[PDB]
């Protein structure tokens, strides 16, 4: 199928507590592979997956160089943002950036991303045509204006549709054994009496990769949608993911319910019944 590469950054100003902390991370699909931490001692982009550990010293030099430049850039954008919002130079703020690309199952560009959030809400983002910007507010309109006069977007297009896809393609090869795997969910059901007349059925999905999954409960074939408790898909810590879905059921009606598991590692969706 398709694949993605994502870089995520966070810069957190620390007034009355230091100088702005910058953390960047790289993902391919749902597998992290580099980090950078401005407070860590190394001051180096480091490997986080086994399959990236096979790049030359000059990859690491170069990737360290770029991330460090980004950290100085968002350091200064933090200052500019304080201005644009007329905010005190004494409070802590958050500049978050994401960028990267998707590719289709043959390797071709699908989509490029470049976007910014300030204090957790949208700031400015590159629209899909890689040609225009979507600004969240008046403050981000100053930026949109600056960046259109300057043709910032056209100049990102070399990276988005070239470097980004090419690196993604090179990662999917050197990481084939781990990044083109599809690990289907190990499923089971639990069942706990809650009262004289009520029971919890919980549908478990374990050990799957990639993270995307869907679990829905039916009652006699009808989607049960509000009696259902659903957890955020979580990481096991070994590179796979977990999730569960639970319904509270009247005692003795357990057979009436079924749980349905769709994951791209499953030929046919699984239906589970206590």
């Amino acid at each position: 199928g398709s694949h993605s590469m994502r870089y995520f950054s966070t810069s957190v100003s620390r007034p009355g507590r230091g100088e702005p902390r910058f953390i960047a991370v790289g993902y391919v699909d749902d597998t992290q592979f580099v980090r950078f931490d401005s407070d860590a001692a190394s001051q180096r982009m480091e490997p986080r997956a086994p399959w990236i550990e096979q790049e030359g010293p000059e990859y690491w030099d170069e990737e360290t160089g770029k991330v460090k430049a980004h950290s100085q850039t968002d350091r200064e954008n933090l200052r500019i943002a304080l201005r644009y919002y007329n905010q005190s130079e004494a409070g802590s703020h958050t500049l978050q950036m994401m960028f990267g690309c998707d590719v289709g199952s043959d390797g071709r560009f699908l989509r490029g991303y470049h976007q910014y959030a300030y204090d957790g809400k949208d700031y400015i983002a590159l629209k899909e045509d890689l040609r225009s910007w979507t600004a969240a507010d008046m403050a981000a309109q100053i930026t949109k204006r600056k960046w259109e006069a300057a043709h910032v977007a056209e100049q990102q297009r070399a990276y988005l549709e070239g470097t980004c896809v090419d690196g993604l393609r090179r990662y999917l090869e050197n990481g084939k054994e781990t990044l083109q795997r599809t690990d289907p969910p190990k499923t089971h059901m639990t069942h706990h009496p809650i009262s004289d007349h009520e029971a919890t059925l919980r549908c478990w999905a374990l050990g799957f990769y990639p993270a995307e999954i869907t679990l829905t409960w039916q009652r006699d074939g009808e989607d049960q949608t509000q009696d259902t408790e659903l957890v955020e898909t979580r990481p096991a810590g070994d590179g796979t993911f977990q999730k569960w879905a639970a319904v509270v059921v009247p005692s003795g009606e357990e057979q009436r319910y079924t749980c349905h598991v769709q994951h791209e590692g499953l030929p046919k969706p699984l239906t589970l019944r206590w």
Binding site: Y7, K66, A69, H70, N77, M97, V152, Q156, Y159, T163
Partner: peptide, 9 residues
């Protein structure tokens, strides 16, 4: 591969 990002708000 990271980007070379220098554009200011």
């Amino acid at each position: 591969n990271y980007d070379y990002w220098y554009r200011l708000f």
